[PDB]
PDB file of C-alpha atoms and ligand atoms in Angstrom:
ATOM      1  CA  UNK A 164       0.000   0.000   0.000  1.00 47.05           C
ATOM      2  CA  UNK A 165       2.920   2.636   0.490  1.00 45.57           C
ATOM      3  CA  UNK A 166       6.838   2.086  -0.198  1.00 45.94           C
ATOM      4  CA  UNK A 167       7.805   4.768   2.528  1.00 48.82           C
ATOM      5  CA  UNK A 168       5.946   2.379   4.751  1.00 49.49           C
ATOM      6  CA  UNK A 169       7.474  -0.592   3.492  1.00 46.66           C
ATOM      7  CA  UNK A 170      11.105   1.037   3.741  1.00 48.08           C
ATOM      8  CA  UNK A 171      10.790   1.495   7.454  1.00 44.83           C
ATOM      9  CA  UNK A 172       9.413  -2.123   8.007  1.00 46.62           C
ATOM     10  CA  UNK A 173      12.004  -3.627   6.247  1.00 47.11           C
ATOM     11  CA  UNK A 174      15.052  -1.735   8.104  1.00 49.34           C
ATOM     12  CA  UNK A 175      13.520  -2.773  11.157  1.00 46.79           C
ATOM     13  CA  UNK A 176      12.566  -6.455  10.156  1.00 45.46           C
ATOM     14  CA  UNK A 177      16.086  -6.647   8.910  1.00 43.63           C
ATOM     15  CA  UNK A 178      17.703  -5.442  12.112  1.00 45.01           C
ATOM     16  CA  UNK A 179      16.149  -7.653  14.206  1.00 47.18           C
ATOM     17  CA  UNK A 180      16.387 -10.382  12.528  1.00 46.89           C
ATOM     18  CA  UNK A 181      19.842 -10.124  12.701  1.00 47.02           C
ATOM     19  CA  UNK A 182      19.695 -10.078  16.259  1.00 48.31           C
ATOM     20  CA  UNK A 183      18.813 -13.957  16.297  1.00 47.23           C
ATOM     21  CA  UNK A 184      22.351 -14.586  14.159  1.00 45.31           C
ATOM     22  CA  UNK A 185      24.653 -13.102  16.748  1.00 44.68           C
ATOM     23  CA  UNK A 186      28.462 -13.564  15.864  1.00 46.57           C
ATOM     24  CA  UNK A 187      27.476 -15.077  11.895  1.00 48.85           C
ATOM     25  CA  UNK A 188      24.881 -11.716  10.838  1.00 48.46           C
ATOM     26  CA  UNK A 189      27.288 -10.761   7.944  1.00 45.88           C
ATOM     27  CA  UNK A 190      25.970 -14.648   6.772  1.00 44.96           C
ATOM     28  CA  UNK A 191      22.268 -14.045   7.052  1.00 44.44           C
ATOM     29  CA  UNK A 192      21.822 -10.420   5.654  1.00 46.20           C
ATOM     30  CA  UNK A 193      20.441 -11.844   2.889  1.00 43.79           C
ATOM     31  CA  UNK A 194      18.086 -14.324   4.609  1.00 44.92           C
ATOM     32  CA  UNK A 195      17.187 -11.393   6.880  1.00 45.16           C
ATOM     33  CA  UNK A 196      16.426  -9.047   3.623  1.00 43.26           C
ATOM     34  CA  UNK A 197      14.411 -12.194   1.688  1.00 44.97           C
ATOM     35  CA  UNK A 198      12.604 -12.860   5.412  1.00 46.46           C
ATOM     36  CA  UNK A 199      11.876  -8.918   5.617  1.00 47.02           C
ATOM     37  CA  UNK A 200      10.263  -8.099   2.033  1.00 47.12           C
ATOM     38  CA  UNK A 201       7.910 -11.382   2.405  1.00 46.15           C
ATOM     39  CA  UNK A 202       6.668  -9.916   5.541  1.00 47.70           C
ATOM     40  CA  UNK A 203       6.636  -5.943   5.041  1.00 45.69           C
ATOM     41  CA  UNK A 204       5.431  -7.179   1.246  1.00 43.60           C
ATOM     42  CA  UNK A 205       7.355  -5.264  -2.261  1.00 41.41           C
ATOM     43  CA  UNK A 206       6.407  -3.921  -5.169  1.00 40.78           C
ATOM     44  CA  UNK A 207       9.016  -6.195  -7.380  1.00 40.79           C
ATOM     45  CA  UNK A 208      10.024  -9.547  -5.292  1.00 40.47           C
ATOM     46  CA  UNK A 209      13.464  -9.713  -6.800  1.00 40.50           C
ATOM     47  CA  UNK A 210      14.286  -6.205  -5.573  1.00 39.00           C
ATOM     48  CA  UNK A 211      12.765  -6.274  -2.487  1.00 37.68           C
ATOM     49  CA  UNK A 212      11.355  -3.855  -0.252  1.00 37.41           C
ATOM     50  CA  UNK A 213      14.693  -1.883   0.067  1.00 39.12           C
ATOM     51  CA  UNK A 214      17.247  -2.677  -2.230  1.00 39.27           C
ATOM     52  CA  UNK A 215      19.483   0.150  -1.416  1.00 36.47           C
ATOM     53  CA  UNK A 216      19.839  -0.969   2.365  1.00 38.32           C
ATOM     54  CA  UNK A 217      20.147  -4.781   1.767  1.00 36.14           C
ATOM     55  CA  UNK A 218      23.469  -3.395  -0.931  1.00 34.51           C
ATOM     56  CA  UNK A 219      24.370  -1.187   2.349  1.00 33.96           C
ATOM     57  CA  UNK A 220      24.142  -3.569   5.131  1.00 32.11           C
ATOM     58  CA  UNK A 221      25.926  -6.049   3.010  1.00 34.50           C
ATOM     59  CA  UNK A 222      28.814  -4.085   2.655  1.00 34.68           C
ATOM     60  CA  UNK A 223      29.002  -2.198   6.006  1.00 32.74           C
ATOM     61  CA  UNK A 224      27.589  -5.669   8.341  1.00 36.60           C
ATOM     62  CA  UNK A 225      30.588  -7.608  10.145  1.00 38.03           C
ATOM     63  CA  UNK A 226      30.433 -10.250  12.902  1.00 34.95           C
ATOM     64  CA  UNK A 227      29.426  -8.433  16.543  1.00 34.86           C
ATOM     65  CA  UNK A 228      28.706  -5.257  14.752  1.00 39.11           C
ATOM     66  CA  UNK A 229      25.418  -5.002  13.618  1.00 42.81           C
ATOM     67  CA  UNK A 230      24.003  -1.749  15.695  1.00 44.51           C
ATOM     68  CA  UNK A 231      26.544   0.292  13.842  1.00 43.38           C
ATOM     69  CA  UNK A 232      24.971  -0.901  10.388  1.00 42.66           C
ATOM     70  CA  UNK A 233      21.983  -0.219  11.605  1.00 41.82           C
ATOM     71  CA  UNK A 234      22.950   3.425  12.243  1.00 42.47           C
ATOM     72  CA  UNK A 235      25.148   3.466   9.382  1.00 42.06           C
ATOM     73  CA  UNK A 236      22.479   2.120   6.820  1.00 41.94           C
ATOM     74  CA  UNK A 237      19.431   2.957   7.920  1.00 43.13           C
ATOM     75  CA  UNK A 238      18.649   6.599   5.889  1.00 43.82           C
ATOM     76  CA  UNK A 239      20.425   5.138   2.659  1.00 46.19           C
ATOM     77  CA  UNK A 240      18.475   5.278  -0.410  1.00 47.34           C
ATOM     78  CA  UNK A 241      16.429   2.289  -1.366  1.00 42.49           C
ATOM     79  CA  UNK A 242      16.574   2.979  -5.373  1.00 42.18           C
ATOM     80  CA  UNK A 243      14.096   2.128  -7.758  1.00 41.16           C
ATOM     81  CA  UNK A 244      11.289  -0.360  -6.060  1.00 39.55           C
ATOM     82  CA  UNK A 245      10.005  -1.211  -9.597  1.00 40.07           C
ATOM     83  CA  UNK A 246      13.014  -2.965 -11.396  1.00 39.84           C
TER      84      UNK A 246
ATOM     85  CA  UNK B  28      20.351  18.712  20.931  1.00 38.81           C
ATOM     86  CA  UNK B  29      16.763  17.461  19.136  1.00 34.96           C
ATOM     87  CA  UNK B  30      14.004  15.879  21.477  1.00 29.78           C
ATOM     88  CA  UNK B  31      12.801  13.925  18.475  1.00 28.38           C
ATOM     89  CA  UNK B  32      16.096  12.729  17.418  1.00 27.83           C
ATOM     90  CA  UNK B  33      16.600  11.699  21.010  1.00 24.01           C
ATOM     91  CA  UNK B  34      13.003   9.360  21.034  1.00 22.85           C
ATOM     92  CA  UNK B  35      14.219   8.015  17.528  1.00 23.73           C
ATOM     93  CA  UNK B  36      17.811   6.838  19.552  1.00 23.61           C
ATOM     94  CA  UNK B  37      16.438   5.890  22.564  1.00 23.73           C
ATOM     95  CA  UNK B  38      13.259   3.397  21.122  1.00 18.36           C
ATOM     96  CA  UNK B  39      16.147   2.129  19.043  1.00 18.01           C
ATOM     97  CA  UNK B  40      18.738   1.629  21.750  1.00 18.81           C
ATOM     98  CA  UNK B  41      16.243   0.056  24.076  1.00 16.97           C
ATOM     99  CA  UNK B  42      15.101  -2.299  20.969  1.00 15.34           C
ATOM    100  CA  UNK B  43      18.660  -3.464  20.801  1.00 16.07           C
ATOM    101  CA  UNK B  44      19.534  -3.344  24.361  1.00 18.65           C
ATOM    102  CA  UNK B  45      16.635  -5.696  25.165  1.00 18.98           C
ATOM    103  CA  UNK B  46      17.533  -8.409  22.139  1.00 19.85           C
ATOM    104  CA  UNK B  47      20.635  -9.347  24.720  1.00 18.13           C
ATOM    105  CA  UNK B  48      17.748 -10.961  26.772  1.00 19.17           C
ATOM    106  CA  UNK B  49      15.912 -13.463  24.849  1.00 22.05           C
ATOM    107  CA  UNK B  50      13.484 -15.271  26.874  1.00 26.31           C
ATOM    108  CA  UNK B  51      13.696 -12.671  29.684  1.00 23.10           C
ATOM    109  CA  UNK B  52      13.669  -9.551  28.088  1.00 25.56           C
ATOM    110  CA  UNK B  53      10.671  -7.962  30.301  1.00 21.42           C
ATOM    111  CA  UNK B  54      13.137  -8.302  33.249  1.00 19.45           C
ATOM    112  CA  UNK B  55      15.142  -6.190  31.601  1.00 16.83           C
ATOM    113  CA  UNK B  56      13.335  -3.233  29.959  1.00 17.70           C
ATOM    114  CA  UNK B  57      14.077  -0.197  32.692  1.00 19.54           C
ATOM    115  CA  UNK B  58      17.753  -1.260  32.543  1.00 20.87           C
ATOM    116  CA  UNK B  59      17.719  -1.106  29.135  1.00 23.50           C
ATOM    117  CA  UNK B  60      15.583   2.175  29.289  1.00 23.18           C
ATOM    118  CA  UNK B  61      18.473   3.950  31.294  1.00 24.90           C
ATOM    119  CA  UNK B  62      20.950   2.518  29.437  1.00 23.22           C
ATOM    120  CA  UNK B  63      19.329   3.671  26.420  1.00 26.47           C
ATOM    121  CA  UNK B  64      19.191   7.062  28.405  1.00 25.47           C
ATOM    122  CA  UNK B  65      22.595   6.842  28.733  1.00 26.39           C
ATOM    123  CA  UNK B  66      23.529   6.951  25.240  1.00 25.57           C
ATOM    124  CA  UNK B  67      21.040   9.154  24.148  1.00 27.42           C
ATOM    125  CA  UNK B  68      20.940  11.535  26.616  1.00 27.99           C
ATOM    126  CA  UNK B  69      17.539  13.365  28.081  1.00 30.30           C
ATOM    127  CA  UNK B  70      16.627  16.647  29.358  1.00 31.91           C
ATOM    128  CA  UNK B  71      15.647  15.380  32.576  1.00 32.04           C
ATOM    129  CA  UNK B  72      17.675  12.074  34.180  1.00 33.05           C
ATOM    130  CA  UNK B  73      14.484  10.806  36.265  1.00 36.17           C
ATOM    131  CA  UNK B  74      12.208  11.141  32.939  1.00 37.21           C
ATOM    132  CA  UNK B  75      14.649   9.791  30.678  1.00 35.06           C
ATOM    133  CA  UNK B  76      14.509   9.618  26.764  1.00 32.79           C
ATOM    134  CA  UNK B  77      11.291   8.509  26.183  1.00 29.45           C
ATOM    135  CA  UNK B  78       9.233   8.567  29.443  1.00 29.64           C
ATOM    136  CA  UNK B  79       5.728   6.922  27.415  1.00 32.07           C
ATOM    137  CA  UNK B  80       7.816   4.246  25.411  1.00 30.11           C
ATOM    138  CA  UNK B  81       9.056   2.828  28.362  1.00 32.46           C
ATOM    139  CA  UNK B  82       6.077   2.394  30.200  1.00 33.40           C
ATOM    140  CA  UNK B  83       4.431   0.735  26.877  1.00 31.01           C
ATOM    141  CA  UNK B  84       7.541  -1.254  26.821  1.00 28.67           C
ATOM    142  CA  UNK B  85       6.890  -2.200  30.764  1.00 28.32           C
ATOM    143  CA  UNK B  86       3.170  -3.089  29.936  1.00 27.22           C
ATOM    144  CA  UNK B  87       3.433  -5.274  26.608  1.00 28.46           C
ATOM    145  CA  UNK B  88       7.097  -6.939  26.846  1.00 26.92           C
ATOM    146  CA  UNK B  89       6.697 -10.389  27.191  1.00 29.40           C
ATOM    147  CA  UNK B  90       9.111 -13.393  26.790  1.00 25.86           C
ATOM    148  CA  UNK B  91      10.082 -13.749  23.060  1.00 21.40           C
ATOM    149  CA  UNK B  92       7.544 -11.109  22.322  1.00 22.33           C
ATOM    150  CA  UNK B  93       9.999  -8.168  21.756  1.00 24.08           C
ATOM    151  CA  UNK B  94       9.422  -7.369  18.050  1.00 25.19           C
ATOM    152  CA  UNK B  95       5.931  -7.095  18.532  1.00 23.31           C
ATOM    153  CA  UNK B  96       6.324  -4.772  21.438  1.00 22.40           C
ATOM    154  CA  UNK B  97       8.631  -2.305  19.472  1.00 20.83           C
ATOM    155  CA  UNK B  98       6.406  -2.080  16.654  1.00 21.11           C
ATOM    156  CA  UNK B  99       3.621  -1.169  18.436  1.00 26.14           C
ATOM    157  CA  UNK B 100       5.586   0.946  21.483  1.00 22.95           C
ATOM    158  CA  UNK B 101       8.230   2.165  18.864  1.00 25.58           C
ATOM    159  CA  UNK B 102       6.257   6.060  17.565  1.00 23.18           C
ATOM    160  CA  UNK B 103       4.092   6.355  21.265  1.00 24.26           C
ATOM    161  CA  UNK B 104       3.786   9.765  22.709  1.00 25.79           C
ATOM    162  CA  UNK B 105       6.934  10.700  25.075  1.00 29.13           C
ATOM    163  CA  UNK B 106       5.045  12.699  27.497  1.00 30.47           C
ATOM    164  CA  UNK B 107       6.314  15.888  28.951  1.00 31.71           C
ATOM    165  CA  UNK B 108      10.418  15.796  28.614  1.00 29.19           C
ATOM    166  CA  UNK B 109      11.130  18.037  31.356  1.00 30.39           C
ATOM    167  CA  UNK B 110       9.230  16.555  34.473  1.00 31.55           C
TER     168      UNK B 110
HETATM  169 ZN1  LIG C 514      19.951   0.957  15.693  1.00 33.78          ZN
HETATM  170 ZN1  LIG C 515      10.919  -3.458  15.464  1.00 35.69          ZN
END
C-alpha cells in the first residue's frame, strides 16, 4: 500500500532479525532481507522492499557489529522499487 | 540537541539493548531504558529519553515477544520531557 511504509518495516525487520544470528549476521543479511520483504510485502520480489539498504548492510555488516549498520544504513536510499 | 532525534535513539537503543535478553527480556526493559538514556541523553535524568515508550515497553514486553512490542511501542507519545 505505500513504499515509505514498506522502507521502514524492512530496516527494522532486517535489524532484528539479525539479532537472532549473533556472531554469523554478515551470513544471514540476505536471509534477513528475503525474510523482511515477504513480511513488510514489495512492489518487485526480486528487488525487495529496500534494495538500497540490503546493498548497504551487506557491505558495512561484520560479525558483533550489527548496531553500527543499523545506524550506518538505515537513511540510505532504497533505489528504484520497480526494477 | 533534538528531542525527536533523542526518542528516535532511545526506542532504538532500548530495541537493541533488550535483544541481549531473549526469553527474559521484560526483566530487563528499565535497565535497558536507562541505558538507552545513557547513550542518548535526556533533558531530565528521572524522565529519561522517552518517558511513554518505556512504560508501553513495561506493559506489553513479554518473553520472546519483543518485536511485537517495538512495533507497536516504537512512535508512542513521550510525554512531557522536562518533568
Ligand atoms: Zn539501531
Ligand atoms: Zn521493530
Amino acid at each position: 500500500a505505500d513504499c515509505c511504509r514498506m522502507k521502514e518495516c524492512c530496516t527494522d525487520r532486517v535489524n532484528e532479525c539479525l539479532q537472532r544470528y549473533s556472531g554469523r549476521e554478515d551470513k544471514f543479511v540476505s536471509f534477513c532481507y528475503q525474510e523482511a520483504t515477504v513480511t513488510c510485502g514489495s512492489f518487485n520480489e526480486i528487488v525487495g522492499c529496500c534494495y538500497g539498504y540490503q546493498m548497504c548492510m551487506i557491505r558495512v555488516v561484520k560479525p558483533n557489529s550489527l548496531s553500527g549498520a543499523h545506524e550506518a544504513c538505515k537513511t540510505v536510499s532504497c533505489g528504484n522499487p520497480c526494477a
